[PDB]
Design a binder for this molecule. Structure first.
Ligand code: HEC
Ligand code: HEC
Ligand code: HEC
Ligand code: HEC
Ligand code: HEC
Ligand code: HEC
Ligand code: HEC
Ligand code: HEC
Ligand code: HEC
Ligand code: HEC
Ligand code: HEC
Ligand code: HEC
Ligand code: HEC
Ligand code: HEC
Ligand SMILES: [K+]
Lengths: 86, 531, 531, 86
């Protein structure tokens, strides 16, 4: 029997615009966002802590409980202070 | 044609002073008490610099979905509970929303192996935690990063910025009640935010996306007759005559292999299937309202590239010279507008403009800056505003002279650029083109003459004309941002009240673009411009 | 919508006084120094009476090719040298200009025996002495003399004269910089000069030529809504619904065998495949601006012929009476314009027109003749010009009253004629038809009222109104022929400076036409008209 | 072997419009233009002189050397003086 892993999308926003180069921590996994501002994680069932950090000093946190074969998109806005020139 | 006040039961006739949102019929829309948009309705705030002044409707949630739908704080309620397998999505929706499933089943997404890109892949499994997939969702590295990145290469006025800049910081949309400019949200956000553009959901057929008509839904009308110009031109004639003949137009072929008899929008602007639709553009000219000689040696390489596209079905010379004709039409158009603008500017400087900006309702900013003021060219007491600051360019809340100037450059002039670019000779002349600007020049001159004649009479007779009350206030005007700022935040402007960095603060021209221009200006020995 | 002055690198921003042809961006097209068209660019002079004042662009070479391309003095340079066999044309161009070869290979010309009509047959063998084939080239006795002669049977305002008369002696085109009216060259010359019209090069497919849409590229827009009227009418509805159903519309059939459910432009105007598109026309009415009761006994035989065409799918009576309705609409339209014109004429006679022609910029001729003056009807000091001489009918460089009059008869009235003729009921009424003229009559009356009220006030207060400077001069106005003639050839007009015989001098109405009218006038006992 | 002849197109114009009635002679072959205003000649390879004579006493002259199997279109504008009513 194969336990189908959960798929978690995490999008980092700064009042509408995607944050580039933000680091998203979900469980033990790390992802540094590209132009999307979106990281996709494939995770085993369980409860996880999502944390989005960006070099400006702004952070967003959300705790998520994932079942078997769950697909969830998470959208976290870090406010206007997370918007940096170029 | 009458304002019919009969037949329909009286019980539903609205009487003076009654709310407009009662659902009663107000004849010609008169005598109703304006209640405004439902501010209790569950919805999302708009993103961006002017979030605080951005009045929103529930419907907007779909249009910038990452911020306006996908956040837990904003996601709308749903009567169906549970987390489901893909089979369950399809089975239930096949009856509940039949067309969506019909489309999905036709799509390549459904047939994909080893696992299909199903409803759950794009929307989520939990029906209480559904999401709307933005361009970011489609453009993941695992999926369609190529097309996302391609589109994202676009500069200002492209599919990459049409939401984030043009719409999110849209003066008029912010200024007015929502619904006045609801259509702007629905049109502008799509290319940047939703990839169901061009290739419709849920079928996502590239073959339908390759059709010219796809572009028409946005690229038409008063300020960009892109479709109209193409459609009526010989390219559009060839297209309409042959588009269903598979021997002439094969939409199953990829754009790299496109061997049509005539070009499509995609054939020219999405050469090789590149998703940056602005890729081949020479220089951004503010919808063609700003003027440039694109045929000048400065832009030789960029014009040459266009000749390379026309080369497919024409001699280089024929194409080169036809586009040169466009350049000439563009230059001659601005000659006319300069004359038109002079008439309007003189009225302001002579102070005989009826009325002066100070006697109009305050602009979106809460200021009395002249509508037509371009901060880069105009500075003085008469113009208003700080040095380098422009006015709110508009066709509303202004004089006829201001309005006609806006129409001349903002409508008619664009018909000349777009007309000549797409081969519509009538769009550039008779059909509100060159001769449109001619007609408006006459209209401006006449309005100037009348205003000057009245001012002269009033001086001699010793009347000091008091500008009427309707220039300042009115049922619609009172609902704008201008009056609100003046009343509630007396000393300040909208820029003070919205101090956050804008799109222009964080987005700059690409290095290669600056590099090209600097190289070419040195090569030709032309002086660089100013701020 | 703003005049965007950001993002785009500053180095390319044009500053006041800089040349417009530098390639720099001028915001809203302002502050640039007008350099005018490239007069050093290798090109051809235009043919005809007004050759000397006809400013041309390189692109024009293709449009009247016999004079503007094919002469040794004018033929443009070409980077490819040598004289080639047909095989060589095809092989090289198959890659260099792929679409042209794709088209050619599909054409009957390529398949013809014993020898094909190849690239060399139409263009020549010597690549340094290439020629562009005009209608004369196609219409050689050995080839398609039949179609050439058919087309050539057309009178004034036909495909036989649309270049030689309408365009070559086009007042506005001559008057203005080239590019202002570039589209006019591209549109007007084609039917007369280039047989790639209707059946596109290089495929030359009669099947595509039989489609209604072919005509739309020229027969649309502000002053002839031919396509729009047809398209939206029930004939056009039938067409759009059925055109790709081979059982309803078979485009492979010749027009003699056309058994469509509904008519096409070609079905009516090119009956039997005759290339004189004007063959069935009753009388030339200057785009429908001039008025005639086509249903009058004078034109009985000509109207009967039209009924013969409608007879195909309707009872004679139904068609007869429907075209009678058109006649009535046309007559009622001119009734309105007569009232509109009276208001404008009265302003001139009373001298209260703001301003009078003498205070406007000189017309293309270098004169101050009244815009609306028709030489055959108007004579006097107030009108200007010699006896029998008309004014320059225009929508530009005039008063609002003059402009609105032009628009009423030159746009709206044509929508009534063309609308009713093609079955578009809305084009003849709501959609800028009858009710368009109504709106403009109101606009004219209001402008007349205001001008008269100001004149009365100025008399009583003792102001003699000095017409403003912008009526006389301006950035665009200064570039026209009028000011140039007045300055550089003081005593003379353009007709003095261009003494050569015009088109009207060498081209007359056919003998049979005069013979018919004289016979019918005698038959009915109606007095003949004057010069 | 077949010496493939050269095809010579001679178009007489008067600042635009084709001159009807005008006659064109090249070599021994004498053509006289119709409404089309063009004469198609088929000539043995060599050097030939072209003369365009009219009733209105106006002419244009030119000379062409045609190789084997050449196609050349010649346009000669005689001027406004070669233009009479009807
Ligand atoms: C609406 C949803 C659109 C569809 C469908 C298409 N386009 Fe578009 N396009 C749209 C907007 C709102 C904008 C820019 C707005 C702004 O920020 O100024 C554009 C932009 C372009 C451009 C660039 C124009 C410029 O000034 O640089 C091009 C060349 C363009 N669009 C072409 C285009 C084509 C070919 C399309 C069909 C395949 C198409 N667009 C679809 C809105 C919409
Ligand atoms: C099926 C036959 C449909 C019915 C019935 C209605 N609509 Fe529709 N709509 C349909 C399709 C296939 C599309 C294209 C989707 C795309 O990706 O562009 C649409 C589009 C719209 C839109 C614009 C697209 C968008 O902004 O999301 C709107 C606003 C819309 N539809 C609304 C709408 C309404 C209100 C309808 C009832 C009156 C309606 N649609 C009917 C398919 C179908
Ligand atoms: C209209 C202007 C479009 C917008 C906006 C987007 N796409 Fe598109 N797409 C468009 C066309 C005309 C085509 C066919 C082009 C061709 O190469 O022939 C496509 C194609 C795709 C494809 C298929 C890729 C391929 O194998 O050729 C994908 C996967 C695709 N497009 C994705 C996509 C995404 C993710 C978009 C949003 C950012 C998007 N497209 C926007 C036209 C248009
Ligand atoms: C090829 C023959 C084309 C087809 C088919 C269409 N367009 Fe085009 N477009 C073309 C050219 C050569 C130009 C001028 C570009 C220049 O600066 O020299 C344009 C212009 C536009 C623009 C403006 C772009 C800008 O940079 O300002 C837009 C927005 C545009 N065209 C859109 C468009 C659409 C929607 C079409 C389909 C109906 C279309 N174009 C057809 C060439 C060609
Ligand atoms: C006669 C039936 C023709 C044959 C055989 C070919 N072409 Fe042609 N071509 C023809 C016409 C009537 C025109 C229009 C001329 C004008 O004055 O505008 C043309 C035009 C061209 C052009 C230039 C126009 C353009 O689209 O760029 C070229 C470069 C051209 N033709 C090339 C060409 C080639 C390579 C051919 C052989 C395959 C060919 N033509 C055949 C008429 C005829
Ligand atoms: C542009 C290249 C055209 C195409 C394609 C077609 N027509 Fe035309 N047509 C055109 C012009 C410029 C003119 C006359 C201009 C002038 O000298 O006044 C015409 C004329 C006609 C007419 C006669 C109108 C009149 O007042 O007598 C008719 C009836 C007509 N055209 C019909 C027509 C049809 C049916 C076409 C499609 C097959 C068509 N035209 C093509 C320009 C162009
Ligand atoms: C092939 C797919 C083409 C591309 C790419 C472009 N054009 Fe085109 N054009 C094409 C055809 C088949 C036709 C019809 C030819 C006819 O006989 O009418 C045209 C037409 C034009 C025209 C008008 C016809 C004329 O006056 O000669 C113009 C002015 C024109 N084409 C120019 C043009 C330019 C500037 C292009 C690049 C942006 C271009 N065309 C692309 C086929 C194709
Ligand atoms: C549009 C108004 C046209 C113009 C201008 C020219 N032609 Fe045409 N042509 C047109 C149609 C609709 C048709 C099909 C008519 C029919 O009989 O069904 C044609 C047909 C031809 C043909 C084929 C002759 C035949 O066997 O039926 C030829 C050889 C032809 N046309 C030549 C031609 C020439 C030389 C033109 C310039 C003077 C010309 N055509 C103009 C539509 C139109
Ligand atoms: C048959 C039912 C027709 C079709 C299909 C189209 N037209 Fe027509 N047209 C038709 C009539 C009966 C008339 C009136 C002629 C009269 O004087 O009684 C017209 C008029 C025109 C004209 C004006 C001609 C003139 O002599 O002034 C033009 C230029 C014209 N139509 C063009 C035209 C075009 C381009 C069409 C296709 C879209 C078209 N017509 C359709 C009859 C019919
Ligand atoms: C009933 C189903 C019908 C049959 C069977 C036929 N026709 Fe008819 N016809 C019908 C209608 C509803 C109308 C419209 C009447 C109106 O008031 O406008 C007609 C119209 C005609 C006309 C006149 C209108 C025209 O297009 O010229 C004629 C001359 C006509 N019908 C003749 C006709 C003939 C000969 C039939 C037998 C083959 C025939 N009709 C069948 C409804 C019906
Ligand atoms: C080699 C490659 C060839 C050969 C053997 C022929 N042609 Fe051409 N031709 C060629 C090129 C690269 C170009 C474009 C030149 C440019 O504009 O930069 C052309 C152009 C033409 C044209 C258009 C002339 C114009 O622009 O006004 C025509 C009408 C043309 N060629 C016809 C033609 C014919 C009839 C040939 C056989 C005899 C022929 N070409 C040969 C490239 C090549
Ligand atoms: C012989 C030919 C016939 C026969 C046997 C029938 N019809 Fe007619 N019909 C005929 C002509 C020549 C005309 C046109 C008359 C004209 O307008 O000049 C008609 C006309 C009609 C009409 C239209 C009447 C109208 O214009 O208002 C109708 C509706 C009609 N015909 C019907 C009709 C029917 C039902 C017949 C069989 C019983 C019939 N016709 C016979 C010619 C002929
Ligand atoms: C042109 C006019 C017209 C000619 C003058 C006449 C007499 C009418 C009559 C009316 C009236 C009355 C109505 C009812 C509305 C009102 O406010 O008085 C009007 C309606 C109308 C519609 C309905 C649209 C809707 O209700 O949403 C339609 C489809 C109309 C179209 C015709 C038209 C055909 C092309 C032409 C011509 C006229 N109308 Fe009308 N009409 N009409 N109309
Ligand atoms: C209607 C308006 C609108 C509603 C009010 C809003 C806010 C916008 C925003 C803009 C801006 C800003 C631009 C950039 C140009 C400038 O001069 O300020 C404008 C561009 C525009 C184009 C691009 C055309 C080009 O660049 O050649 C297109 C395709 C637009 C179309 C939409 C439209 C969809 C049918 C509607 C509604 C509006 N626009 Fe816009 N927009 N827009 N626009
Ligand atoms: K018949």
């Amino acid at each position: 029997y194969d336990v189908k892993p959960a798929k978690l999308w995490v999008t980092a926003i700064a009042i509408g615009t995607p944050i580039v180069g933000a680091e998203i921590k979900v469980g033990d996994e790390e992802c540094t966002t590209g132009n999307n501002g979106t990281c996709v994680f494939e995770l085993r069932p369980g409860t996880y802590a999502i944390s989005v950090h960006e070099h400006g000093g702004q952070s967003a946190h959300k705790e998520v409980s994932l079942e078997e074969g769950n697909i969830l998109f998470v959208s976290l806005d870090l406010g206007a202070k997370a918007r940096h020139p170029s | 044609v009458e304002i019919i006040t009969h037949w329909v039961p009286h019980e539903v006739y609205g009487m003076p002073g009654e709310p407009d949102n009662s659902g009663k019929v107000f004849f010609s829309g008169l005598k109703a008490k304006y209640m405004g948009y439902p501010k209790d309705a569950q919805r999302s705030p708009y993103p961006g610099k002017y979030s605080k002044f951005w009045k929103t409707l529930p419907a907007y949630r779909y249009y910038i979905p990452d911020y306006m739908y996908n956040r837990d704080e904003v996601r709308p309620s749903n009567p169906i509970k549970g987390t489901f397998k893909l089979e369950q999505c399809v089975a239930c929706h096949s009856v509940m929303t039949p067309g969506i499933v019909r489309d999905y089943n036709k799509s390549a997404h459904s047939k994909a192996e080893p696992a299909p890109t199903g409803c759950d892949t794009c929307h989520g499994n939990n029906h209480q935690k559904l999401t709307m997939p933005s361009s970011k969702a489609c453009g993941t590295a695992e999926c369609h990063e190529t097309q996302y990145n391609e589109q994202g290469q676009g500069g200002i006025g492209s599919h990459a910025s049409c939401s984030s800049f043009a719409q999110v910081e849209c003066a008029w949309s912010i200024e007015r009640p929502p619904g006045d400019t609801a259509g702007c949200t629905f049109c502008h956000t799509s290319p940047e935010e939703r990839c169901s553009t061009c290739h419709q959901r849920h079928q996502f057929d590239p073959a339908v996306a390759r059709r010219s008509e796809q572009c028409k839904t946005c690229h038409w009308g008063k300020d960009h007759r892109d479709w109209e110009a193409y459609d009526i031109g010989l390219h559009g004639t060839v297209y309409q005559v042959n588009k269903w003949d598979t021997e002439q137009f094969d939409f199953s072929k990829k754009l790299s292999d496109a061997d049509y008899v005539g070009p499509t929008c995609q054939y020219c602007h999405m050469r090789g299937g590149h998703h940056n639709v602005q890729r081949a553009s020479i220089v951004y000219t503010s919808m063609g309202m700003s003027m440039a000689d694109r045929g000048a040696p400065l832009w030789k390489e960029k014009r040459d590239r266009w000749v390379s596209i026309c080369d497919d079905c024409h001699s280089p010379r024929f194409a080169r010279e036809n586009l040169q004709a466009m350049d000439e039409s563009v230059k001659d158009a601005s000659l006319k507008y300069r004359e038109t603008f002079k008439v309007a500017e003189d009225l302001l400087i002579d102070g005989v403009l009826d009325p002066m900006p100070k006697d109009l309702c305050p602009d979106w900013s809460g200021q009395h800056i002249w509508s037509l003021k371009i901060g880069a060219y105009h500075d003085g007491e008469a113009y208003g505003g700080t040095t380098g600051e422009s006015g709110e360019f508009r066709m509303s809340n202004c004089t006829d002279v201001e309005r006609l100037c806006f129409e001349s450059v903002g409508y008619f002039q664009t018909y000349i650029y777009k007309g000549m670019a797409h081969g519509s000779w009538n769009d550039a002349t008779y059909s509100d083109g060159s001769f449109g600007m001619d007609r408006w020049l006459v209209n401006v001159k006449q309005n100037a003459s009348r205003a000057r004649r009245l001012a002269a009479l009033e001086k001699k007779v010793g009347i000091s004309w008091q500008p009427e009350q309707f220039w300042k206030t009115g049922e619609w005007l009172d609902q704008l941002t201008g009056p609100y700022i003046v009343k509630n935040h007396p000393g300040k402007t909208i820029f003070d009240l919205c101090p956050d960095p804008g799109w222009l603060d964080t987005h700059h021209a690409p290095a290669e673009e600056v590099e090209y221009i600097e190289r070419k200006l040195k090569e030709l020995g032309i002086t660089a411009g100013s701020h």
